[PDB]
Amino acid sequence: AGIKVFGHPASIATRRVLIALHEKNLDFELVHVELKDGEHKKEPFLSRNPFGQVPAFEDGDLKLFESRAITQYIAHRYENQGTNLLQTDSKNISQYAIMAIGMQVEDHQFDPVASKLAFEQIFKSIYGLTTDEAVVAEEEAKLAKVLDVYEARLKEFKYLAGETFTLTDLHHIPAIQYLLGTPTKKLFTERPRVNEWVAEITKRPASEKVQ
Amino acid sequence: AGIKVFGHPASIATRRVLIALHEKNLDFELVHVELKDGEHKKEPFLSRNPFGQVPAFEDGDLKLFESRAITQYIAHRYENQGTNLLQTDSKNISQYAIMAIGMQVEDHQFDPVASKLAFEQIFKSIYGLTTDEAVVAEEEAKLAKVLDVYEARLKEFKYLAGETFTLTDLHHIPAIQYLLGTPTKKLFTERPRVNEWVAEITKRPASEKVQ
Amino acid sequence: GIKVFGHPASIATRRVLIALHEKNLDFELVHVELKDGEHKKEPFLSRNPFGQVPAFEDGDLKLFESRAITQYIAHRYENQGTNLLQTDSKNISQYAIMAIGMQVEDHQFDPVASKLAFEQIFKSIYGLTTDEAVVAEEEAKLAKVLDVYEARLKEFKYLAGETFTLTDLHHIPAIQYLLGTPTKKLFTERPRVNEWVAEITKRPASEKVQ
Amino acid sequence: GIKVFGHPASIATRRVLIALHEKNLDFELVHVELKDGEHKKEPFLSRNPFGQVPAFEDGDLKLFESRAITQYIAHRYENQGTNLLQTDSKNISQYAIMAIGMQVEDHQFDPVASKLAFEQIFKSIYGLAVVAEEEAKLAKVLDVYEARLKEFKYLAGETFTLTDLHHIPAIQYLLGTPTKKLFTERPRVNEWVAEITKRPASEKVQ
Amino acid sequence: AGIKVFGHPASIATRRVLIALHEKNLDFELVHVELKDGEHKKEPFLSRNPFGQVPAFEDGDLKLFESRAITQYIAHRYENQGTNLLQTDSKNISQYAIMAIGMQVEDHQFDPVASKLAFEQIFKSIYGLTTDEAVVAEEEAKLAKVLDVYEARLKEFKYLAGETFTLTDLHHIPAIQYLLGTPTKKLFTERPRVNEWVAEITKRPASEKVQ
Amino acid sequence: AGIKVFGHPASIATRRVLIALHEKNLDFELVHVELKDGEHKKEPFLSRNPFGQVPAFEDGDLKLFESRAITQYIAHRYENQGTNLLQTDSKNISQYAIMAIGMQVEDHQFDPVASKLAFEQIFKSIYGLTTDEAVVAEEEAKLAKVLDVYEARLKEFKYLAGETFTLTDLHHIPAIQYLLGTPTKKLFTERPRVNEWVAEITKRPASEKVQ
Numbered sequence A, B, E, F: 001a002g003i004k005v006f007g008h009p010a011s012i013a014t015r016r017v018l019i020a021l022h023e024k025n026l027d028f029e030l031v032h033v034e035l036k037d038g039e040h041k042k043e044p045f046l047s048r049n050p051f052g053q054v055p056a057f058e059d060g061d062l063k064l065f066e067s068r069a070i071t072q073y074i075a076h077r078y079e080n081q082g083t084n085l086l087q088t089d090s091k092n093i094s095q096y097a098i099m100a101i102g103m104q105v106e107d108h109q110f111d112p113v114a115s116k117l118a119f120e121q122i123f124k125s126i127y128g129l130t131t132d133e134a135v136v137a138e139e140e141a142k143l144a145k146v147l148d149v150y151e152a153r154l155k156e157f158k159y160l161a162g163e164t165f166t167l168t169d170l171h172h173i174p175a176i177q178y179l180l181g182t183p184t185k186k187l188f189t190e191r192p193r194v195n196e197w198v199a200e201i202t203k204r205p206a207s208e209k210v211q
Numbered sequence C: 001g002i003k004v005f006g007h008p009a010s011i012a013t014r015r016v017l018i019a020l021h022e023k024n025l026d027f028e029l030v031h032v033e034l035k036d037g038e039h040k041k042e043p044f045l046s047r048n049p050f051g052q053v054p055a056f057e058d059g060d061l062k063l064f065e066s067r068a069i070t071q072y073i074a075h076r077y078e079n080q081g082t083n084l085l086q087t088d089s090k091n092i093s094q095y096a097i098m099a100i101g102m103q104v105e106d107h108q109f110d111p112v113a114s115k116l117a118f119e120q121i122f123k124s125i126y127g128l129t130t131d132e133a134v135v136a137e138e139e140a141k142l143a144k145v146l147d148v149y150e151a152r153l154k155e156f157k158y159l160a161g162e163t164f165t166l167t168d169l170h171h172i173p174a175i176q177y178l179l180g181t182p183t184k185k186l187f188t189e190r191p192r193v194n195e196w197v198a199e200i201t202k203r204p205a206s207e208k209v210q
Numbered sequence D: 001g002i003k004v005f006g007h008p009a010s011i012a013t014r015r016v017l018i019a020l021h022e023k024n025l026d027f028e029l030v031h032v033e034l035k036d037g038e039h040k041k042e043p044f045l046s047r048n049p050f051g052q053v054p055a056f057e058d059g060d061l062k063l064f065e066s067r068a069i070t071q072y073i074a075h076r077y078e079n080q081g082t083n084l085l086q087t088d089s090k091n092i093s094q095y096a097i098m099a100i101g102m103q104v105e106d107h108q109f110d111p112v113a114s115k116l117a118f119e120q121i122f123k124s125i126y127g128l129a130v131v132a133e134e135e136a137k138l139a140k141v142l143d144v145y146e147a148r149l150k151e152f153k154y155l156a157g158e159t160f161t162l163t164d165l166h167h168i169p170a171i172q173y174l175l176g177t178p179t180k181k182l183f184t185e186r187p188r189v190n191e192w193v194a195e196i197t198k199r200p201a202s203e204k205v206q
C-alpha cells in the first residue's frame, strides 16, 4: 500500500516504525512475520533482511531494514505531512547534529538497558521464570544514571533535542510503554521533567495506536 | 465445593492436571489465573501457592499445588473411576516403584529440556523475541539422548512403566503437544517406538480436550 | 539382598542410605568411582542409562533415581523401623500433602542448595574461587524457600505434619553440607527452620552417613 | 575552530579523526587522560554527561557520540575533500540505504569486533571461550558483507561512504590479530578491507 | 619424624610430589587433608601453607609447600638415590637451564590448560554439571599447539629436556593421567613421539603407584 | 656472540631479565621486539620462542626463553660476580628450597594479580579503554591477602627467602615499579615491613636502570 512493514506487533523495534508512520498519517500494511515458523530465517524474508530480524520495510520499490534507518527515511521522505519528526528547521545542520546525538544516546545508553528490564520483568515472569532481581537492580541503577542525564537535559529544553518532539523522543516510546507496566515506572515518576516528558510522549495518539 | 484448578489453559503444568481430571471423567472448574497481568505473583494466588506457579488445586477442603503431586492425588483418590492411571495392580509395590522411576525421569531428564525448548521456540516467538539458536541446539542434543533411552525402553514395553498407560506417560503429554508444533518434532518422528508412543498418547480424548 | 551403587559423599546416594538406616535394613554400598567416570561406563550404565548415582537393587528389583528408591523403601518396609510415610499411610489426602513437600524439595530447594554447596565447598577442592555474586543470588532464592518453610513449621512440627517423613528426609544430605558453609546463617536466623534442621541432622541415621 | 576531545587509540575517537582527515580539515586533538578518569570528571562531563570519548567542538557547536560527529562532518563540509555521503546526497532513497549500513555497523559489527580485537590483543601482548564465540558471530556478519560486496563496490553502493568509514578503526585493530583470517578468507571482504585501510586518512590515525 | 606429605591422593599437585618420592624409593607418610571440610583453609594447615593449597611437606625440620619447589628439593637432596631426576650431569649449568625452560613451560603453558580440560570433562560430571563444549574446544586448540611444540622437541630428544627422564617430564604425569581418561586423549595419540613419551612416563612404576 | 635479550623495554617479563643482568654488571644487547606489530607472533621470533612471548635470550650458543628460567640461569652461570642472587650459601639444599617456594609464590600468587592491576590501571589507557573499577577492587582484595602473607614473612626475615636479597625478591620488582605509579601503591605503603622491602628493592641501582 505503498508502504509495508514486515514485523511483529509486540516488537519494540517494529513499534518504533509504526509510531513514525502514524505520526505522518500514512497508510500502510503490517505483515505479521511468523517467528514460530522461522519465517524470519527463510527466503523470501532474508532477501528483505539478511540478518533475519524484524522489522523490514518497503515503500514501493525501496526495501529497508533497521528500525532507526526506517524512521529516518519516513521523517525525510514524508517531511511535509503530519507531524514534523525533524527539527523545526530541518535543513539546519547544527540542529540536526544535536538531534543525532540524542538518537545515538537512545540507541546506546537507553535501549539495551530498557530491553533487559522489560525481558526480566515482563517477558520472563509470564512464563514461570523467576525474574533475576540482581539483573533488575543492576539495570535500574544504569537506567537511573541515564535518566539523571535526561532530567538535566529536560530542565533546559522541552524535548530531548530542543523545543519540539522529534525522532529522538519517538525512538524511546515503545520501550517506555513496556516499562510503565513494571515497578521500573518509579524511575520515571521520581524525576519531574522526565515524568512530564513520558506523560506527553506516551499520550500522543500515534503512541496509543500501537499500544 | 468440588474440584477447582487455578491455572491457565495454555500452561504445560496446568494441562498436566487437566488431562488427569479428564482421564478420570471428573467435573471441575478451571479458575483462570491471568499470567500476562502477573496474577500468579500476587495475592490471593500466592496464598494458594507461595511459589507463584500455576496450577494450584482444591478438592473440597484439600488445597494442593505442584502439578505432579495433584495428578498423583487424582490417580489415588479417584482410582476406581475412569482410566486407571496407576499400574494394573496398584498395590504391587515393586511395579509402583518402576512407574516412580519413570515419573522421576520425566521430571528430571525430560521436562527441564522440553520446557526450555518450548520457551525458546514458541513462547519467545509470541512476544516478538528472537530464539537463541545455541540454546535450541544444545537442548535438542540433550533431548535426543533422553529419547534414545525412551526408544530402548519402549522396545521392551508398550508404555514407559510397563504394558499400560500410566502417570509416567501422562506427565509428558503437554510438553510434547507443544513440541510437535516446532522443528523439535523430528526428534520424536525419527525414533519409531517413540513416534508410535507419541501418536498414541496425544490422540487420547483427554489429551485432545486440552489442546 | 539390598545393594546401593553409589558414592558415600554423593547427596543423592546419602538420601537412599539414610532411608535404609531409618528402616534398620542391611545392605551393601557398592562404590562407584565418579572421579574415574565409572558412572558413565558399562556396567553402571546398564543399571542407570542416565549415568547418575545411585542405582539400587533389592533382590531382582532394579531401580534408579534416589527419590523413587526412598519411596520404595518407605512402602516395601513400611512396618519396620521408622515410619517414613504419614502416620496413617493409607490416608490419601495426607499422602498428597507429603507429596507437595517432596515436589517442593526437588524443585525449589535442591537445585539452589546444590549450587550453593558447589560454589562454597566443591569449587575450593579444585583451585577455584567462589563467585560471591552466585552465592548472594542463590542465598536470596534459598531465603525465600526457607521463609515458606518457616511459615509451614509454625503450624506443623515437620514439613508434612506432626511427624518426620520422606519430605524432611530428602533434605538432609544437602543440609549436612550447607551447615559447613556461611549459608548456615539462613537456617539459624529462622527459629523453627533452625530447630527442624537441628532435629533432622541429629537423627542417628543422619549421623551414620556424615 | 575544530577540536576533538579524546584519545588517539580509542576506536570511537579514530572514527571522528578519519572523517576529519578525509575532509582535509585542520583540528586540534585534545587528549583526555582515561587512566586518570578525566572522562568521568568535570569539566569533561559538561561536554559529555555520559563520560565517553570523544567529545567535539566546531566553533560554538558542541557534540558527542562519534557517529553523530562524523555525520555532522559529512554534511557541514560536504563539498570539500572526500564525499562521505552518497554521490547524490539529496537522494532520499540512497541516503536510507547508507543509513541501513550505518545501523548494521553499529548493531551487528562493532560490538563483536571491538570485543574480539580487545580480547586478543590483550591475550597476545599481556597473557590475559570468548574468541571462538565472537569469531563465529563475526563470520556470519562477514558472510552477509561478502554477499553485499558481490553486488556493490562498497557497502552502501558504488562509492566509499560513512558506512565503510565507521568500520575502519575496529578493522585496523583486528588486522593485528589472528581474526584477520576471517577477512582474508572472503575475497570481496578482503578487497574492501585492503581498499579502506590503505586510504591516506586511515593510515594517518593508525 | 621423617618425610611427610600433607595433601590428598587425588590432587594433581599432591601426586607430583608423591611420584618424585617413589622415584627416589623414599619412605614417607601421606597425611590426608580433608578438602571437602575446608581443612586446607584452617589452622593448623595454614601454618604449613598460608595460601591454603595442598600439598605441604616436611622432611625432618624442613617445612615446604608448592609442589614444584618440593620436587626440586627431592631431586637435589636425594640426588644419589633412586632415579636421577636432574640432568645426567647435574652440575652442567647450561643443561640445567634447558630443563628449567621445560619446567616453566609445563607450569605456564600445559598445566592451566590441562586443568581446565580435566575440570570440564571429569570433575563437573561428579556434581551434576554439564561440560561446556566451547571451553573444551578452546582448551584443546591451546593444548594441541602446546603438544605440537612437544612433538617437535621429542623428534630431537628422547625426553623434553634431553636424553633422560627429568623433573620436566615428571611434572606433567598427574594431569596426563587424568586426561587419558577423557576424549582429550586423542591429542596425545595422534602425535607419535608425544604418544610414545606419554606411554613411557605413565607406565613407570612410580606413576602407576599414585594412579 | 655475547649476551642478547630479545624483548621490549616496557615488558614486565623482559625487565626481570634486564634487572638480573644489571645486578651481575653484565654487558649485553637488548634487541627490540615490536609487540605492537605482532613481531613476537612471527618468524624469526617464533624460532627463539615457539610460544611467542618476550623475552627470549642468548648467551653465546645457549638459547633460552621464560623470564624465570633465564634469571635462574644468570644467577647460576654468573654466580661468582656482582650481586649474589642465590642464597648466601648456594649449595645449601634446604635454603635453596625455601627460595624456590618464594619464586613459586611470586609466579602463582602475586604476578597474575599484579599484572591484572597494572593492565587495568595503566595499559588499558594505551588502547583508549576505561579502567573497570570492579576488577580493580577485586584484584586489590586479592593483592592485599598476598601482601598480608608477605608482611608476616618480612616480620621474620629481612627479605622473602631469608637474610639477603635473592631472585625471589628480584622477580617482583618490575610489576611493583608499575604499581607504585597507581593508587594500588597504598597496599604497599599501609604495611610497614612490605613498605620498607619495596623501598629497598626499587632503589637498587639495577632496578632504577630499567625504568
Ligand SMILES: O=Cc1c[nH]c2ccccc12
Binding pocket: A069, A070, A072, A073, A074, A076, D089, D090, D091, D092, D093, D095, D096, D097, D099
Ligand atoms: O537526507 C536524507 C536523510 C538524512 N538521513 C536519512 C536517514 C534515512 C533516510 C534518509 C535520510
Ligand SMILES: O=Cc1c[nH]c2ccccc12
Binding pocket: A098, A099, A100, A101, A102, A103, A105, A149, A150, A153, A160, A161, A162, A168
Ligand atoms: O537529543 C539531544 C541530546 C543532546 N544531549 C543529550 C543528552 C541526553 C539525551 C539527549 C541529548
Ligand SMILES: O=Cc1c[nH]c2ccccc12
Binding pocket: B098, B099, B100, B101, B102, B103, B105, B149, B150, B153, B160, B161, B162, B168
Ligand atoms: O517408567 C519407568 C521407567 C523405568 N525405566 C525407565 C527409563 C526411562 C523412562 C522410564 C522408565
Ligand SMILES: O=Cc1c[nH]c2ccccc12
Binding pocket: C097, C098, C099, C100, C101, C102, C104, C148, C149, C152, C159, C160, C161, C167
Ligand atoms: O510437606 C508438605 C508441604 C506442604 N506444603 C508445603 C510447602 C512447602 C514445603 C513443604 C510443604
Ligand SMILES: O=Cc1c[nH]c2ccccc12
Binding pocket: D097, D098, D100, D101, D102, D104, D144, D145, D148, D155, D156, D157, D163
Ligand atoms: O550499507 C548498506 C547496506 C545495505 N544492506 C546491507 C547489509 C549489510 C551491510 C551493509 C548494508
Ligand SMILES: O=Cc1c[nH]c2ccccc12
Binding pocket: E090, E091, E092, E093, E094, E096, E097, E098, E100, F069, F072, F073, F074, F076
Ligand atoms: O645449575 C643450577 C641451576 C639450578 N636452577 C637453575 C635454573 C636455570 C639454570 C641453572 C640452574
Ligand SMILES: O=Cc1c[nH]c2ccccc12
Binding pocket: E098, E099, E100, E101, E102, E103, E105, E149, E150, E153, E160, E161, E162, E168
Ligand atoms: O624441557 C625443556 C624444554 C626446552 N624447550 C622446551 C620447549 C617445550 C617444552 C619443553 C622444553
Ligand SMILES: O=Cc1c[nH]c2ccccc12
Binding pocket: F098, F099, F100, F101, F102, F103, F105, F149, F150, F153, F160, F161, F162, F168
Ligand atoms: O621465599 C620464601 C618464602 C617462604 N615462604 C613464603 C611465603 C610468601 C612469600 C615467600 C615465601
